[PDB]
């Protein structure tokens, strides 16, 4: 009833990446939730896309 040999066959050596992600689902969810709060500066190319931002944009930095 163990499907572990399949993981060894397919994701054998690179299983460390999956384990590191798994240990960090809570951290990733917290990162996404903070990301949606828009409490940061966002890089924008030209003035045109500056308008194309969420009603919650709080900082922006335009390059060119």
């Amino acid at each position: 009833r163990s499907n572990d040999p399949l993981v060894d066959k397919v994701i054998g050596n690179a299983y460390a990446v999956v384990r590191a992600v798994y240990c960090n689902l809570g951290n990733l969810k917290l990162l996404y939730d903070f990301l949606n709060t828009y409490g940061m500066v966002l890089g924008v190319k030209s003035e045109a896309e500056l308008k194309k931002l969420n009603k919650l944009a709080k900082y922006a930095r335009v390059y060119g």
């Binding site: 009833r1 163990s2 572990d4 040999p5 060894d8 054998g12 050596n13 299983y15 460390a16 384990r19």
Partner: protein, 234 residues
Amino acid sequence: MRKLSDVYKVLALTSLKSAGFITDDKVNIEAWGKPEVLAHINEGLTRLHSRFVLRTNNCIVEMKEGRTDYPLLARYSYERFDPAKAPYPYIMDTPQEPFQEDVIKILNVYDSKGIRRKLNDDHDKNGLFTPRPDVLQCMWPRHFEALNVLYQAKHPELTGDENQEIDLPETLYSALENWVGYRYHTGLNTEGSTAKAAEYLQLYESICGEVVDFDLANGSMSNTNVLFEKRGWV
């Protein structure tokens, strides 16, 4: 437990006596044929350690999560970890007795709890298949596990150092010489030397037959019939 230096001398007096590379003192082998002789002793011990069960050793194999195939090589061990060819070490060896990559046949593997796991049993969850002689395929790497793997072993590889000690029964040294003589005399491709190689090779079987006809290599086995009480039979 003789030394490779002594084996060179005893080879120079009995088997390789007419060989060219025998030095002027007749009690040693010249430094140009030593790689050749050493490559014959190493093969000689491998054959002798294959027929008879001469060296039974067990090396414990810790479980790493996500890995089912567990090759029993020396690159995966602890004291000989090779980061270039092994992601993590999982075998366990002490500095005084490191893993020597000397597995010929795997015989019986226990667990960290004491439960014996069958080998090559198709219908047997809790069974460790071996897809190739020097590997191991545990299909359920449970937490906090390990595997004392009792296996037939060969003599550790003779690098060439003249101070490395050789683990052979004293009664089987008359067969190692008769196999070095075979390998050496059969390569000259001369009619006289080839006919001597056959005699030396056949004598190897004769001595390897007298060792098994007198139980000098511990081949006969007797065990208590524990099956009797289990099947009923009051």
